Write a protein that binds this ligand. Structure first.
Ligand code: HEM
Ligand SMILES: c1ccc2c(c1)CCN2
Length: 291
């Protein structure tokens, strides 16, 4: 399967910076969502789940085709709760009907991270919508109730290595688990709509307790009111993972730099970019624009 990036006709940096600003302006406006967390965390989760279907072996799945717009992927049990990120973006797609679905879902994730004061993420245009029959089947996204060997093995399919996996998981400092979506409940920290390295700090400094929640699932709970998933706590159980966790709890700039590279790579897996294709765009935030 080859998927070649095709820039939307005649579009350039300024067009996509207009779509960025539209998403970012609505993130500021619709602030009440999920008890004032706002839409940013569900939008970086949506960009991860449309990319996380990729399989390196046959180049199926991935962010290129925008296939989450089809019922099979929209109704995947693993995507429960992401309909709220879709409905947030649907106004903006009506306003810029020329951007492809893959591009709009991935730029929403980029915009949310930078607007929640994360690192800049280089983003590239050119994903092309593909037919309903290209939609990957349910079951390619990871279970939460498993251990470190499962996480390592699952992420080899998206060929991410240990460092990349640990840098990507730092995004679980954002938002929260919702019992009616996943059977898990609670936030992982106090700053859950500002991008920081707090996931790593909480993992190493809190007093975790294995408890059973109302959906009868086990999760790691702390006195402070935070929770960690079994696959999250996995990172301090494995010796290779645990020493990268310590590296990111001791250096927030290295965390930001490595997250930026692994999230771009995540979003680009499966796509062939021609050598005459434009460079990756670095978008300015509303704040850097005085907007
Ligand atoms: C083995 C890996 C992973 C598993 C099992 C997993 C699982 C989960 C689960 C069960 C939730 C709760 C969903 C809900 O109830 O609403 C969640 C939320 C979230 N995850 Fe993951 N995740 C994984 C990796 C990642 C990665 C790599 C990213 C992003 C780079 C990510 C970003 C998020 C975000 C931002 C949320 C919060 C959503 C919200 O607030 O609504 N996840 N994760
Ligand atoms: C979302 C998903 C999982 C998780 C958090 C948020 C806090 C720590 N575990």
């Amino acid at each position: 399967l080859v998927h070649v990036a095709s820039v939307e006709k005649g579009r350039s940096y300024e067009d996509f910076q207009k779509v960025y600003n539209a998403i970012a302006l609505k993130l500021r406006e619709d602030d009440e969502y999920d008890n004032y967390i706002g839409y940013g965390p569900v939008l970086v989760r949506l960009a991860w789940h449309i990319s996380g279907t990729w399989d390196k072996h046959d180049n199926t799945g991935g962010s290129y085709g925008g296939t989450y717009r089809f019922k099979k992927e929209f109704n995947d049990p693993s995507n429960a709760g992401l309909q709220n990120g879709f409905k947030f973006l649907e106004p903006i797609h009506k306003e810029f009907p020329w951007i492809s679905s893959g591009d709009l879902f991935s730029l929403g994730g980029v915009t949310a991270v930078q607007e929640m004061q994360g690192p800049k993420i280089p983003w590239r245009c050119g994903r092309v919508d593909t037919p309903e029959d290209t939609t990957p089947d349910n079951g390619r996204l990871p279970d939460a109730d498993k251990d470190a060997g499962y996480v390592r093995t699952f992420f080899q399919r998206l060929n991410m290595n240990d460092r990349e996996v640990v840098a990507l998981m730092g995004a679980h400092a954002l938002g929260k688990t919702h019992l009616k979506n996943s059977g898990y409940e609670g936030p992982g920290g106090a700053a859950n709509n500002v991008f920081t390295n707090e996931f790593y700090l909480n993992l190493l400094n809190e007093d975790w307790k294995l408890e059973k929640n109302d959906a009868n699932n086990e999760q790691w709970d702390s006195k402070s009111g935070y929770m960690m998933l079994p696959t999250d706590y996995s990172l301090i159980q494995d010796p290779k993972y645990l020493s990268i966790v310590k590296e990111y709890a001791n250096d927030q700039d290295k965390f930001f730099k490595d997250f930026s590279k692994a999230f771009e790579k995540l979003l680009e897996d499966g796509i062939t970019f021609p050598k005459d294709a434009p460079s990756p765009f670095i978008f300015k935030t509303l704040e850097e624009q005085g907007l």
